[PDB]
Design a protein around this ligand. Structure first.
Ligand SMILES: Nc1nc2c(ncn2[C@@H]2O[C@H](COP(=O)(O)OP(=O)(O)OP(=O)(O)O)[C@@H](O)[C@H]2O)c(=O)[nH]1
Ligand SMILES: [Mg+2]
Length: 176
């Protein structure tokens, strides 16, 4: 059982940090822009069930975005990340959501698993209100929302638990 998860979001929101924190329990304040898309794997237990989580990290900068988009189509869950201290990254969520739908072409789009992460909550200069973020998530088809901190490892395991659970459900429905 291989679960494919795709992480999308603007440059600098912390996609790579979140993945490394979750997969390797490691964080680095040093920024290294992601080029293209690639994955890291992590075997995990989803409600007493072993699965191989294939987590795809992508380039937030359009300049480093690859033309290869085949990795999308079989996705079981799409993770949308934004920076709680940067409203601009929150306003682009619809574009990221739409890009995922277009590239993955899931059947029954409105029910495909999306999980939103408001990252960098550890910073004092927060600018995106929780209520505002929850409202957007609700306007979608009520997709789960988690406020996280890759740096302080806050809510990372919890968020990925839901990501893994929902990805499994989607995966199961597909094979059926
Ligand atoms: N305060 C804080 N800063 C964070 C956190 N996670 C990442 N950052 C910083 O946000 C910056 C971007 O982190 P990355 O993980 O490289 O961001 P990205 O989304 O992978 O950027 P691209 O690969 O270019 O799309 C870096 O300065 C990180 O140190 C976090 O939880 N809290
Ligand atoms: Mg990156």
């Amino acid at each position: 059982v291989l679960l494919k998860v795709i992480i999308l979001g603007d440059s600098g929101v912390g996609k790579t940090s979140l993945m490394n924190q979750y997969v390797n329990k490691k964080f680095s304040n040093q920024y290294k822009a992601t080029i293209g898309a690639d994955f890291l794997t992590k075997e995990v237990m989803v409600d007493d069930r072993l699965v191989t989580m294939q987590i795809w990290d992508t380039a937030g900068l359009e300049r480093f975005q690859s033309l290869g988009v085949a990795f999308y189509r079989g996705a079981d869950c799409c993770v949308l990340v934004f920076d709680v201290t940067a409203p601009n990254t929150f306003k682009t969520l619809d574009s990221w959501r739409d890009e995922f739908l277009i590239q993955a072409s899931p059947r029954d789009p409105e029910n495909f698993p999306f999980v939103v992460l408001g990252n960098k909550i550890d910073l004092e200069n927060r600018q995106v209100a929780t209520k505002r973020a929850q409202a957007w998530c609700y306007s979608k088809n009520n997709i789960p929302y988690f406020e996280t901190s890759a740096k302080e490892a806050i809510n990372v395991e919890q968020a990925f638990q839901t990501i893994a659970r929902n990805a499994l459900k989607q995966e199961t429905e597909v094979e059926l």
